[PDB]
DNA sequence: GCATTAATGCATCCGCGGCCGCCCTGGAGAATCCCGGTGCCGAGGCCGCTCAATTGGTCGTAGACAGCTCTAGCACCGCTTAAACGCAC
């Protein structure tokens, strides 16, 4: 199983810790920057995706 | 034949009157909202693939922990001008 599974966190974890290191960032990364980051993601993207939705049906669209 | 004097054709200067345009009220017509109504098409649930996230071990390595060093920020003191404020035209 996967860390974000037992983390509860929809975002991959092991996605963006692998696009870090292959990111040209840091040689040193810490197990904290991957999940720190699938949550802000994950959040924002959930405000995001609510307001939209939001626009959406105040528009008679289901889209 | 010439002046002349009353009859006559207008002379041009007002008197009068035919001559309008603006607000307020009378509804009239175009535009909008909105879902039925049906045709269209793509969002996505399902099927099959595949590749890298996870696991464990190896191994070396950077940073918290003091630990120490020294250093300028600050609170304080008092002089010297020095602009800011209120006013007034």
Known sequence: ????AK?????????????????NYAQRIGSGA???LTAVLEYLAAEIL??????????KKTR
């Not at 199983?1 to 974000?4: G, I």
């Not at 929809?10 to 292959?22: E, Q, S």
């Not at 609510?50 to 528009?59: H, I, P, Q, S, T």
């Open 1 to 4: 199983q996967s860390r974000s």
């Open 7 to 23: 983390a509860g966190l929809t975002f991959p974890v092991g996605r963006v810790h692998r696009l870090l290191r292959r990111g």
């Open 34 to 36: 991957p999940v720190y």
């Open 50 to 59: 609510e307001l939209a939705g939001n626009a959406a049906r105040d528009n």
